[PDB]
Amino acid sequence: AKKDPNTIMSANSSYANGANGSVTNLEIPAAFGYTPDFRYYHAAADYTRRPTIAFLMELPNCFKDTDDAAKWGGSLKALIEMHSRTIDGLDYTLEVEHVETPFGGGGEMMQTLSKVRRARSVPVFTWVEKIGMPVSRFWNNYILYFMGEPNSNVAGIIGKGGITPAATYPDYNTFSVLFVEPDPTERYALRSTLITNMQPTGQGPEMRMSKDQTSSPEQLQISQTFTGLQMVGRGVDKLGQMMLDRASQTGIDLNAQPAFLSDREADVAARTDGYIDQLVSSLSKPGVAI
Amino acid sequence: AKKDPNTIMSANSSYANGANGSVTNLEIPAAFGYTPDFRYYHAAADYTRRPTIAFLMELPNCFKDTDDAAKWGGSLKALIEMHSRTIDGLDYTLEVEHVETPFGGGGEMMQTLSKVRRARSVPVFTWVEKIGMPVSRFWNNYILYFMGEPNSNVAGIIGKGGITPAATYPDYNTFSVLFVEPDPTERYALRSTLITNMQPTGQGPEMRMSKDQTSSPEQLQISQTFTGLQMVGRGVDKLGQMMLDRASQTGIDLNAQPAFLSDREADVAARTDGYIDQLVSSLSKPGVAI
Amino acid sequence: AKKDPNTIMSANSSYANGANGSVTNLEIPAAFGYTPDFRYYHAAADYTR
Amino acid sequence: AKKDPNTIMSANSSYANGANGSVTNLEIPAAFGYTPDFRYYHAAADYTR
Amino acid sequence: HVETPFGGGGEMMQTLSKVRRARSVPVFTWVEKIGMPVSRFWNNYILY
């Protein structure tokens, strides 16, 4: 119940600027020197990765030209944030390059800095399909009516009148999402990324049919890849922290949630052939005495 | 037994236009957010995939020049609809392609929409041979007479004098089929495809022979690949639903069906050597009384 | 199996004078306009030498 | 989905006289100077033949 | 068959060209007996 006061950085400074939570001090004695020290074991706790959260920032402008923008917007929001079974393809690792010249004839070489780069994010989503199969319809109709159509290569929305001449710009049929890596307590942001220019790319939903009556019916799983143009910095970290602050937990107790069934339905009460029924209206009790 | 009123979309609109059955409302909270809520578990039921039904729509015109068009046209319908052990190769997945140009020298890029295309169906049927080899004979004679003949590359039906010109058009020796992927109750159609221009292509039936008297005799399976042009959309779904409204299940009950034998056959009744015979004729019948 | 009655030239006149067999009608829609139509694909059958 | 109001020419004039649609301003900062700017990426869309 | 695109969406049109038939390459198998009458038979057949 005690640890050294220098275990946690007093202030988030220098290379820890912009950090949201508590950052361990690297100047505390470590285990891999001469010998491990038990006095500083509180500072040896590890870091474990937690699932990422998708926050939707922008809706496409094409939704306003349909019959119900509320439906399209809400469906996209739920699919991005709540139906996301998995995510993958996010990466902004750095990469350094050097130029090399021999240092004498003996075999040594002299290395000089050349360039620095950054990896690219390729958002990938996975969904599990449901009764009435709404997800495949959502994405197929999105592509067909807001992007090209295979037979003619023209969006099906333009079959209406009055679509603006500026339909070809990305804002018409693209959106933006924010990815955040929270802490174990879900109170601070450790990593954030802001990707835009997002619309379906590559293969669409898997639409296939076949007949085999002896084979057990199976379960479909949608997977889609997206375009992206990502940004990272400290402003994105602040944006992620604000988004995380909007999601408060005070007062929540999953143990004390009210049961989703308050009491048995009326049909059960009428059958009068249960455990309580025998006591209520079968046995006599003249009483007990001594 | 009480789901929320908003689990099922009240009406099919937006991306659900033309849907036949009941489509789940996709703005109900899902289980992959902060926590799942047990009050919305009826909405977690998963889509499960059922076998495809094939309907014959057109017959080749060459059946007319034959001595019996009825038998050809009945055999083709039965083979397509009833004897089809397995079907595969039906696919109309989409595909989107983009073009790129770097957004600076860091590594990022800007992707611009280029084109959208659709997949192609390659129907494959599979059958099991029967006594007399009717399937292999049907298909071999179809190819030989209504299609090229290997030693002359001429249809064998032309040996009759009077065959009309315009025998090179597909309507002479091609047919059409409609495929439907229904729901668990088999009342509403979820996916459909209307392929035409269908006729055998590539390898025909098996046709090998061999001698081995020490081996166990084996069966014969027929695999046939076809050609075709397919259409997809909403009109095809309406056509499929019109087809599936027929073949209604009202009235039938497999459990209550009559047995395929009503009573023992006469020769059995003449032997007089069974269970009932002992009671009826052998045992003494004095009567029991007290 | 049915097709458009205008699929085949009926007279073999103009540039089809002297033809022996049947000739397709060039005035029925082809696939390389705005979009193809599946109602007229019978005229998309091709030549083979 | 919001983009810079100055992304498109207000009037097709100068070298854009007679243009038949929307034309990029060619005045928004490009991506090949000191750095690319993400506030002006809507104008980085490319013509496609 | 031959093939030609039916529009630019990806669908294609297929037409008949030719029909061909397979070819037989018979193979027999025997088991040798005392003496070697089978080998002698075939070798002398070929040689003479």
Residue numbers in the entry:
A (entry chain L), B (entry chain G): 2 to 291
C (entry chain B), D (entry chain A): 2 to 50
E (entry chain H): 99 to 146
What did the publication describing this PDB structure actually write?
Like other described contractile ejection systems and bacteriophage tails, the contractile tail sheath of ϕKp24 is assembled around the inner tube. The structure of the tube-protein (gp119, accession number QQV92088.1) was predicted using AlphaFold2 and flexible fitted into the ϕKp24 tail EM map. We used gp119 to build a model of the tube of phage ϕKp24. One ring-like structure consisting of six tube proteins represents an assembly unit of the inner tube of phage ϕKp24. There are two most prominent features of gp119: (1) the long C-terminal extension can reach another gp119 located in the layer directly above (toward the capsid); (2) the N-terminal domain can extend to a neighboring gp119 in a same disc. For phage ϕKp24, the sheath interacts via hydrogen bonds with inner tube: the residue R623 of the sheath protein gp118 can interact with residue D268 of tube-protein gp119 via a salt-bridge. The outer surface of the tube subunits displays a positive charged patch. The C-terminal domain of the sheath protein binds to the tube’s patch via a complementary negative-charged patch on one of its two α-helices.
The Klebsiella jumbo myophage ϕKp24 displays an unusually complex arrangement of tail fibers interacting with a host cell. We observe the tail fibers are branched and rearranged dramatically upon cell surface attachment. This complex configuration involves fourteen putative tail fibers with depolymerase activity that provide ϕKp24 with the ability to infect a broad panel of capsular polysaccharide (CPS) types of Klebsiella pneumoniae. We determine the structure of the capsid and tail at 4.1 Å and 3.0 Å resolution.
